């Protein structure tokens, strides 16, 4: 079942959330990715459903902003680069997007993107996508291995200087088939 503390006792900081284990500490199954389909920069795979469940949360929030940051690729640094090893494929950045299928950069600050009005005390789930972007036509087979974190720039009054919220490590798997 799905039940949570809302408008009741035992709530964390109001302005913020905890981030669930289901979001700070998981793996995206990007399925297979095929070399043979990435034959120009427009090439965009069947965008897998992905979310960051925030819970438990407190009782007073107004929204956040995201802050995704990772190793950005040389080609289009808006795409999350791979582990950068011989066995990681070339010219195939990770394509992390929101439900609007809009390219989300990394090393932007929290200003170039946004978030929804958080509900208090619930498994606050927006809907996002992850898949695999062609930045070139290398079609060298290999595996999918990346690392970033999201921060949430919680709309607290920012009295202390900002940092990362967490080290909520986004890991994505997958496989470039040679067909």
């Amino acid at each position: 079942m799905a039940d949570s503390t809302i408008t009741i006792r035992g709530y964390v900081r109001d302005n913020g959330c905890s981030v669930a284990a289901e979001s700070t500490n998981f793996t995206v199954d990007l399925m297979e990715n095929a070399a043979k389909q990435f034959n120009n920069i427009g090439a965009t795979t069947p965008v897998v459903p992905f979310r960051i469940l925030l819970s438990p949360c407190g009782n007073a929030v107004s929204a956040v902003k995201v802050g995704f940051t990772g190793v950005a690729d040389s080609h289009n640094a808006n795409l999350l680069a791979l582990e950068n090893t011989v066995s990681a494929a070339s010219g195939l950045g990770i394509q992390l997007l929101n439900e609007q299928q809009n390219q989300i950069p990394l090393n932007a600050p929290s200003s170039a993107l946004s978030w929804t009005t958080l509900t208090p005390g619930k498994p606050n789930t927006l809907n996002f996508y992850a898949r695999l972007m062609a930045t070139q036509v290398p079609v060298t087979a290999g595996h999918i291995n990346a690392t970033a974190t999201f921060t949430l720039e919680y709309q607290d009054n920012h009295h202390h200087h900002h940092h990362k919220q967490a080290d909520s490590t986004i890991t994505i798997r997958g496989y470039v088939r040679d067909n």
Side-chain angles (χ1 to χ4, degrees), residues 82-144:
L82 322 94
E83 63 173 335
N84 189 254
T85 207
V86 285
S87 317
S90 290
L92 283 172
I94 280 273
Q95 206 193 12
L96 285 169
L97 317 107
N98 66 172
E99 68 207 324
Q100 309 182 108
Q101 334 168 313
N102 189 247
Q103 191 185 70
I104 261 167
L106 350 183
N107 322 97
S110 29
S111 308
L113 35 276
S114 59
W115 204 258
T116 287
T117 314
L118 270 288
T119 307
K122 104 168 175 202
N124 276 275
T125 298
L126 282 82
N127 305 278
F128 306 133
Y129 305 119
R131 221 69 241 280
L132 202 289
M133 182 90 282
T135 57
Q136 286 292 257
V137 181
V139 298
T140 268
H143 47 44
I144 283 55

Side-chain angles (χ1 to χ4, degrees), residues 1-5 12 16-28 49-58 64 66 68 115 118-129 150-152 154 165-166 168-170:
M1 68 170 66
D3 191 12
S4 54
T5 211
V12 298
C17 195
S18 275
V19 195
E22 319 211 281
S23 58
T24 200
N25 247 228
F26 89 108
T27 296
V28 180
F50 151 55
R51 57 91 174 81
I52 290 147
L53 186 156
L54 291 330
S55 166
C57 313
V64 321
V66 68
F68 252 110
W115 204 258
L118 270 288
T119 307
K122 104 168 175 202
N124 276 275
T125 298
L126 282 82
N127 305 278
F128 306 133
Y129 305 119
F150 47 98
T151 64
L152 290 325
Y154 303 124
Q165 46 144 43
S168 25
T169 291
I170 238 279

